[PDB]
Amino acid sequence: PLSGLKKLIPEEGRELIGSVKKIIKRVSNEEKANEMEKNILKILIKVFFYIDSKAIQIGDLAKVDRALRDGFNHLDRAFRYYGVKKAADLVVILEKASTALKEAEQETVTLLTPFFRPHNIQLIRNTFAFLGSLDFFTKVWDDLEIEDDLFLLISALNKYTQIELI
Ligand SMILES: CCCCCCCCCCCCCCCC(=O)OC[C@H](COP(=O)(O)OCCN)OC(=O)CCCCCCCCCCCCCCC
Ligand code: NA
């Protein structure tokens, strides 16, 4: 099943992936949501094992971690204006988040390429490309019945920015 997949993930990872999956299921579709959750789960498990086997150091994720935190912060600044403006009016903050997430993608690919086979690399590009697209943020912020689900996601991203990775 899938219960053994999520157990090797910290609780903050389960919360974040759960809220993300809810969001994808709202704006996109169910198969896209389960696909993205399988992707993030596989990536995170393989990374955690690559660090536990000392194949890579914890500092090797410094740039990925920084870019992820910056994208999450930009998504918080944009979440401040949810329900008061449209996604086209908030294009600045959201494209800042998208650029940060693209940096996170490129550094993740840079780090994991000597280990993954090319299919898992393309899986990285697909996951980051979908979850970090400005069209994705545009669809989320324009949707009306998400404030409840988006609040859980932003709250999950906030407490990741509190766990300093060092
Ligand atoms: C768009 C983004 C897609 C990303 C998909 C690929 C997965 C990321 C791969 C790189 C790993 C990151 C660094 C790992 C360090 C680490 O994991 O440490 C941090 C904690 C601690 O864990 P610990 O104390 O047990 O171990 C520590 C021993 N070293 O773990 C986690 O909370 C993992 C959380 C993963 C982040 C979620 C990724 C998905 C984000 C989706 C939301 C963004 C879009 C929002 C749309 C509106
Ligand atoms: Na909602």
Short mmCIF file of C-alpha atoms and ligand atoms in Angstrom, two decimals:
data_model
loop_
_atom_site.label_atom_id
_atom_site.label_comp_id
_atom_site.label_asym_id
_atom_site.label_seq_id
_atom_site.Cartn_x
_atom_site.Cartn_y
_atom_site.Cartn_z
CA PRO A 1 0.00 0.00 0.00
CA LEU A 2 0.93 3.62 0.65
CA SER A 3 1.08 3.65 4.47
CA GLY A 4 4.66 2.36 4.43
CA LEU A 5 5.61 5.20 2.09
CA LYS A 6 4.47 8.01 4.39
CA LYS A 7 5.92 6.49 7.57
CA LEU A 8 9.51 7.16 6.45
CA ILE A 9 8.58 10.87 6.18
CA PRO A 10 8.60 13.38 9.07
CA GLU A 11 5.21 14.53 10.31
CA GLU A 12 5.76 17.97 8.78
CA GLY A 13 6.33 16.22 5.46
CA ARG A 14 3.07 14.29 5.82
CA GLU A 15 1.20 17.50 6.66
CA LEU A 16 2.75 19.39 3.74
CA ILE A 17 2.19 16.59 1.21
CA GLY A 18 -1.37 16.13 2.47
CA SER A 19 -2.33 19.78 2.09
CA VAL A 20 -0.57 19.92 -1.30
CA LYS A 21 -2.50 16.85 -2.44
CA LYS A 22 -5.76 18.49 -1.34
CA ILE A 23 -4.86 21.58 -3.37
CA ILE A 24 -3.99 19.61 -6.52
CA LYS A 25 -7.20 17.61 -6.14
CA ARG A 26 -9.10 20.91 -5.99
CA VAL A 27 -7.55 22.87 -8.87
CA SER A 28 -6.38 19.97 -11.06
CA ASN A 29 -7.70 16.41 -10.73
CA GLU A 30 -7.45 13.29 -8.58
CA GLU A 31 -5.00 11.37 -10.77
CA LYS A 32 -2.71 14.42 -10.91
CA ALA A 33 -2.89 14.68 -7.11
CA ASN A 34 -2.02 11.03 -6.47
CA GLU A 35 0.70 11.20 -9.14
CA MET A 36 2.30 14.26 -7.54
CA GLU A 37 2.10 12.74 -4.06
CA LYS A 38 3.78 9.55 -5.30
CA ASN A 39 6.45 11.70 -6.95
CA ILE A 40 7.21 13.81 -3.86
CA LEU A 41 7.15 10.69 -1.68
CA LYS A 42 9.60 8.76 -3.88
CA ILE A 43 11.94 11.75 -4.22
CA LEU A 44 11.95 12.46 -0.48
CA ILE A 45 12.53 8.80 0.44
CA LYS A 46 15.41 8.44 -2.02
CA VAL A 47 16.96 11.69 -0.77
CA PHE A 48 16.59 10.71 2.90
CA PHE A 49 18.27 7.39 2.14
CA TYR A 50 21.03 9.08 0.14
CA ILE A 51 21.77 11.27 3.18
CA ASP A 52 21.48 8.37 5.64
CA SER A 53 23.93 6.29 3.57
CA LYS A 54 26.31 9.30 3.55
CA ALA A 55 26.24 9.35 -0.26
CA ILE A 56 25.55 13.10 0.02
CA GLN A 57 25.99 15.51 2.90
CA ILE A 58 23.25 17.49 4.63
CA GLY A 59 24.89 20.69 3.37
CA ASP A 60 24.42 19.50 -0.21
CA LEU A 61 20.75 20.52 0.09
CA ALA A 62 21.58 24.06 1.22
CA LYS A 63 20.60 25.76 -2.05
CA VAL A 64 17.48 23.62 -2.49
CA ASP A 65 16.48 24.39 1.10
CA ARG A 66 17.06 28.14 0.68
CA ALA A 67 15.12 28.32 -2.58
CA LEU A 68 12.26 26.33 -1.06
CA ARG A 69 12.11 28.68 1.94
CA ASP A 70 12.14 31.75 -0.31
CA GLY A 71 9.35 30.37 -2.48
CA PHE A 72 7.32 29.51 0.61
CA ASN A 73 7.82 33.02 1.99
CA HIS A 74 6.72 34.59 -1.31
CA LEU A 75 3.67 32.31 -1.25
CA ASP A 76 2.94 33.61 2.26
CA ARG A 77 3.20 37.25 1.14
CA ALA A 78 0.81 36.41 -1.70
CA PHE A 79 -1.48 34.49 0.67
CA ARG A 80 -1.83 37.71 2.68
CA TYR A 81 -3.76 39.18 -0.28
CA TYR A 82 -5.96 36.13 -0.92
CA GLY A 83 -9.59 37.13 -1.36
CA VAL A 84 -8.75 40.83 -1.71
CA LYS A 85 -7.15 40.78 -5.19
CA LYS A 86 -6.98 38.50 -8.21
CA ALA A 87 -4.06 36.33 -9.30
CA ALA A 88 -3.26 38.69 -12.18
CA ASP A 89 -2.90 41.57 -9.72
CA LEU A 90 -0.63 39.41 -7.52
CA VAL A 91 1.55 38.27 -10.44
CA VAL A 92 4.66 39.88 -8.93
CA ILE A 93 4.84 37.96 -5.64
CA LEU A 94 3.70 34.73 -7.28
CA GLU A 95 6.33 34.93 -10.03
CA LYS A 96 8.91 35.54 -7.29
CA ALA A 97 7.74 32.30 -5.69
CA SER A 98 7.85 30.59 -9.09
CA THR A 99 11.42 31.73 -9.75
CA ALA A 100 12.49 30.54 -6.30
CA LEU A 101 10.84 27.17 -6.95
CA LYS A 102 12.63 26.96 -10.30
CA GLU A 103 15.94 27.53 -8.51
CA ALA A 104 14.96 24.74 -6.10
CA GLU A 105 14.17 22.51 -9.09
CA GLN A 106 17.46 23.16 -10.89
CA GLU A 107 19.49 22.58 -7.72
CA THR A 108 17.56 19.39 -6.94
CA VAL A 109 18.25 18.08 -10.45
CA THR A 110 21.89 19.15 -10.13
CA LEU A 111 22.26 17.24 -6.86
CA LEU A 112 20.32 14.08 -7.73
CA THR A 113 21.50 13.52 -11.32
CA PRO A 114 24.61 11.40 -10.47
CA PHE A 115 22.31 9.03 -8.50
CA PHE A 116 18.91 8.81 -10.21
CA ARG A 117 18.20 7.25 -13.56
CA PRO A 118 16.97 9.81 -16.13
CA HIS A 119 13.32 8.84 -15.62
CA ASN A 120 13.39 9.96 -11.98
CA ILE A 121 15.14 13.15 -13.10
CA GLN A 122 12.29 13.87 -15.51
CA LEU A 123 9.98 13.04 -12.60
CA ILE A 124 11.70 15.84 -10.65
CA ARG A 125 11.22 18.23 -13.56
CA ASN A 126 7.55 17.27 -13.87
CA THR A 127 6.76 17.61 -10.16
CA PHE A 128 8.57 20.94 -9.76
CA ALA A 129 7.23 22.18 -13.10
CA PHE A 130 3.60 21.49 -12.17
CA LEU A 131 3.68 22.47 -8.49
CA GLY A 132 5.71 25.63 -9.15
CA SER A 133 4.00 26.96 -12.28
CA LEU A 134 2.61 30.48 -12.20
CA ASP A 135 -0.48 29.03 -13.89
CA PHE A 136 -0.87 26.73 -10.88
CA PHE A 137 -0.71 29.63 -8.41
CA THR A 138 -3.04 31.60 -10.69
CA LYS A 139 -5.60 28.79 -10.67
CA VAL A 140 -5.29 28.39 -6.89
CA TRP A 141 -5.67 32.07 -6.02
CA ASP A 142 -8.58 32.56 -8.44
CA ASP A 143 -10.51 29.60 -7.01
CA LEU A 144 -13.14 30.54 -4.44
CA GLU A 145 -13.51 27.34 -2.37
CA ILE A 146 -9.84 27.00 -1.38
CA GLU A 147 -9.28 29.52 1.48
CA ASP A 148 -9.77 26.64 3.92
CA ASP A 149 -7.44 24.27 2.06
CA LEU A 150 -4.95 27.00 1.15
CA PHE A 151 -4.73 28.07 4.81
CA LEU A 152 -3.55 24.58 5.78
CA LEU A 153 -0.97 24.56 2.99
CA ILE A 154 0.43 28.00 3.85
CA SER A 155 0.48 27.03 7.53
CA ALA A 156 2.43 23.90 6.56
CA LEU A 157 4.94 25.90 4.52
CA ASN A 158 5.40 28.34 7.42
CA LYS A 159 6.49 25.70 9.93
CA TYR A 160 8.97 24.30 7.42
CA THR A 161 10.59 27.75 7.29
CA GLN A 162 10.94 27.48 11.08
CA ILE A 163 12.91 24.20 10.95
CA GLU A 164 16.32 25.57 9.98
CA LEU A 165 18.29 22.87 8.17
CA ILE A 166 21.91 22.77 9.36
C1 LIG B 1 7.47 22.38 -5.81
C2 LIG B 1 8.29 21.56 -4.85
C3 LIG B 1 8.24 20.07 -5.19
C4 LIG B 1 9.33 19.30 -4.45
C5 LIG B 1 9.33 17.82 -4.84
C6 LIG B 1 10.69 17.17 -4.58
C7 LIG B 1 10.93 16.91 -3.10
C8 LIG B 1 11.99 17.83 -2.52
C9 LIG B 1 13.39 17.27 -2.71
C10 LIG B 1 14.42 18.11 -1.97
C11 LIG B 1 14.35 17.89 -0.46
C12 LIG B 1 14.34 19.22 0.28
C13 LIG B 1 15.39 19.28 1.39
C14 LIG B 1 15.31 18.05 2.29
C15 LIG B 1 15.77 18.37 3.70
C16 LIG B 1 14.73 17.85 4.66
O1 LIG B 1 13.93 17.00 4.28
O2 LIG B 1 14.66 18.32 6.03
C17 LIG B 1 13.54 19.09 6.44
C18 LIG B 1 12.56 18.21 7.21
C19 LIG B 1 13.27 17.58 8.41
O3 LIG B 1 13.24 16.15 8.40
P1 LIG B 1 14.07 15.34 9.52
O4 LIG B 1 14.31 16.25 10.70
O5 LIG B 1 13.39 14.01 9.76
O6 LIG B 1 15.47 15.02 8.81
C20 LIG B 1 16.58 15.92 8.81
C21 LIG B 1 17.84 15.10 8.58
N1 LIG B 1 18.70 15.77 7.62
O7 LIG B 1 12.04 17.22 6.30
C22 LIG B 1 10.91 17.75 5.55
O8 LIG B 1 10.06 18.41 6.12
C23 LIG B 1 10.79 17.47 4.07
C24 LIG B 1 9.83 18.46 3.43
C25 LIG B 1 9.91 18.41 1.90
C26 LIG B 1 9.41 19.71 1.28
C27 LIG B 1 8.09 19.53 0.55
C28 LIG B 1 8.30 19.52 -0.96
C29 LIG B 1 6.99 19.79 -1.70
C30 LIG B 1 6.62 21.26 -1.65
C31 LIG B 1 5.22 21.50 -2.21
C32 LIG B 1 4.73 22.90 -1.86
C33 LIG B 1 5.27 23.94 -2.83
C34 LIG B 1 4.22 24.28 -3.88
C35 LIG B 1 3.00 24.95 -3.26
C36 LIG B 1 1.93 25.18 -4.33
C37 LIG B 1 0.88 26.17 -3.87
NA NA B 2 -11.32 25.11 0.88
#
